[PDB]
């Protein structure tokens, strides 16, 4: 299972997609995931939330004509989610946040 900032960043740069242990919130919800229940691991064993579009609403990440972003959960195993997320762009810039999108740091 690959779920670390560097592990996922390396995987994204190499395969241009997230590791197989990731599923979108839409998929997770359809499988029975209810955030307030902290049951993601119950309905989707070994999975972490990831792949959804990140809109960079506060404009903290560098913008560029045509560039879009996606996000994925980092360091998740089971139970309720944490505040760690990896952010990756369409042209493969990779950033990390450990404070629920408050601040970001380039890691690739």
């Amino acid at each position: 299972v690959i779920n670390t900032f560097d592990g996922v960043a390396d995987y994204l740069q190499t395969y241009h997609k997230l590791p197989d242990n990731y599923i979108t919130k839409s998929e997770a919800q359809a499988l029975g995931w209810v955030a307030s229940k902290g049951n993601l691991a119950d309905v989707a064993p070994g999975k972490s939330i990831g792949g959804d579009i990140f809109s960079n609403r506060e404009g903290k990440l560098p913008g560029k004509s045509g560039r879009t972003w996606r996000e994925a959960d980092i360091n998740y195993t089971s139970g309720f989610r944490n505040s760690d997320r990896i952010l990756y762009s369409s042209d493969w810039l990779i950033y990390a946040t450990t404070d629920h999108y408050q601040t970001f740091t380039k890691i690739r």
Binding site: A35, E58, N82, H100
Partner: protein, 89 residues
């Protein structure tokens, strides 16, 4: 049918607005208190249907342009599937 209430005349800043949302929506302790964190909460935490009553919005707009940006996120979530009813009273 869940309900969230924002008493606009008590909102004195954008930070205060986020703190109120965190309380009303019972958001996670680590809530980022920013637009991206709000979107994350509306797409990965809040349960629907939801009725959001924002009273005296005009006052929030004044104490604060940040209020409109927050309202916009709720409207976007609504356009993208969230069963949200917004009441500006």
């Amino acid at each position: 049918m869940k309900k969230a209430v924002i008493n606009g005349e008590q909102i004195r800043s954008i930070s205060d607005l986020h703190q109120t949302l965190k309380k009303e929506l019972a958001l996670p302790e680590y809530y980022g208190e920013n637009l991206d964190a709000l979107w994350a909460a509306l797409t990965g935490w809040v349960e629907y249907p939801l009725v959001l009553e924002w009273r005296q919005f005009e006052q929030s707009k004044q104490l604060t342009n940040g209020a409109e940006s927050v309202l916009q996120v709720f409207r976007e979530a609504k356009a993208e599937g969230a069963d949200i009813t917004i009441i500006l009273s």
